[PDB]
Amino acid sequence: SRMQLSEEQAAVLRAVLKGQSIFFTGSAGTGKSYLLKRILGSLPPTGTVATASTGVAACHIGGTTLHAFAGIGSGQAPLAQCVALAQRPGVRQGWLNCQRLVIDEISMVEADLFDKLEAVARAVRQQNKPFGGIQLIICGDFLQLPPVTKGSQPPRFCFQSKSWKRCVPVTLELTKVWRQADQTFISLLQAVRLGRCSDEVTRQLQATASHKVGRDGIVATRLCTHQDDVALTNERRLQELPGKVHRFEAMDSNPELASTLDAQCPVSQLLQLKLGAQVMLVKNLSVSRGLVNGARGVVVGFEAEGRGLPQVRFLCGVTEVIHADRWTVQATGGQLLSRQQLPLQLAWAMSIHKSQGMTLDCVEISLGRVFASGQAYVALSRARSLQGLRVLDFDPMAVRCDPRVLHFYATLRRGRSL
Ligand SMILES: Nc1ncnc2c1ncn2[C@@H]1O[C@H](COP(=O)(O)OP(=O)(O)NP(=O)(O)O)[C@@H](O)[C@H]1O
Ligand SMILES: [Mg+2]
């Protein structure tokens, strides 16, 4: 028995099943991605394409990246060239067979890209209708991570596309936060999302600098803005441990394409561990035991036999032997790639981009610098509880809302009751 959809979630599902192209939006942890999974379950799978803007977000819903589905290269080539790319075997069939296109984490899709995809859809499908007649089912939060670009110009938000409102004529909202159960923390997060750091909000975030977020032998994951710093931190902390290194090598269906798998999986080709290593579980092994995607633990031993698999103690108190798992990546043109590896990554540090869409419960962040719009909010809103969060050097300068996004949302609401 599925959880009970809220009335707001039910209204989105109703619209989708009526065939309406929609955008649905809501704060972090309002159940957008969960609702996509419910929508996907409710639809005939033939003709239904599940995508997200990022690899990390696509895996959450069992889908592919928007980039892989589109099959237009970077998207920076001239339109005619993108159309020709979309016409390639495997890519073309994807476009033609698509009746419904799900896109999670839309805030990272820049307007110029959306325009290109819209034009490609019409050309490949030979349908003179918005987005080639595809039913779009889009969600995300424009107050979370901002758009990225494969070019060099300042990206526009997806809603700035001249085709946005024609393509998603209806917007619905999810307004109840579920990730956090604590109303004090819910209200704090909403202040941050809107860029309203009163004296009280700042003091409450500053108070978290004293939080003990870990447990015996488990330390906080430091959320960082850039992968360089993540890598360096994880490598150095592992190097510093006195234990000998235990290695686990991935088995890929096509080892030549290990680079493409590395970019769309949360585990690496070569996993190195020691006693004491700080790790993140990156598969849902057991919701009832708390062994879920994002759970933080520490390696407490290695089995004597066989491969010498790691024993990991998690924040919840469960100690489990971590066995092999598998990922299948839906790459461009219908190609599938798989990787077998243990579902562990080092987690002294993690990038905020890689945390996108996740729930976490043992995190530290330094918020004394200018960040991208929405980026501090994403980092803070990963935590299930305020007591799993440690904010160092907080300054409201870290919390920025792009005025374009506030304007969008205000417009959206103009005719609404609340
Ligand atoms: N109707 C519901 N009742 C109870 N819990 C729910 C409901 N809908 C969603 N959840 C839970 O809400 C939590 C957050 O869901 P999630 O799908 O990650 O939200 P989201 O809006 O996609 N978050 P983000 O990607 O960070 O903006 C998950 O633990 C869900 O199980
Ligand atoms: Mg989500």
Numbering used by the authors: 203 to 620
Lines from the paper:
Pif1 proteins are monomeric enzymes and members of helicase superfamily 1 (SF1), while the 5′–3′ polarity of unwinding place them in the SF1B subgroup. The hPIF1 helicase has the domain architecture characteristic of the SF1B RecD2 helicase subgroup.
During ATP binding, represented by the AMP-PNP structure, R381 recognizes the γ-phosphate of ATP. As such, the aromatic side chain of the adjacent W380 (motif IV) then stacks with the adenine base and together with Y236 forms a pocket for the base. R584 also shifts in position to interact with the ATP γ-phosphate, fixing the α13 helix (domain 2A) relative to the ATP-binding pocket, while Q346 from motif III coordinates the ATP γ-phosphate. Importantly, this conformational rearrangement of the 1A–2A inter-domain linker (W380 and R381) during nucleotide binding causes a significant ∼4 Å shift of the N-terminal end of the α9 helix, which in turn induces a structural rearrangement of the 2B domain. Interestingly, the ATP-binding pocket in the 1.13Å human PIF1-AMP-PNP structure more closely resembles that in the yeast Pif1-ADP•ALF4−-ssDNA complex and much of the water structure is conserved (right), while there are substantive movements when the human hPIF1 apo and AMP-PNP structures are compared.
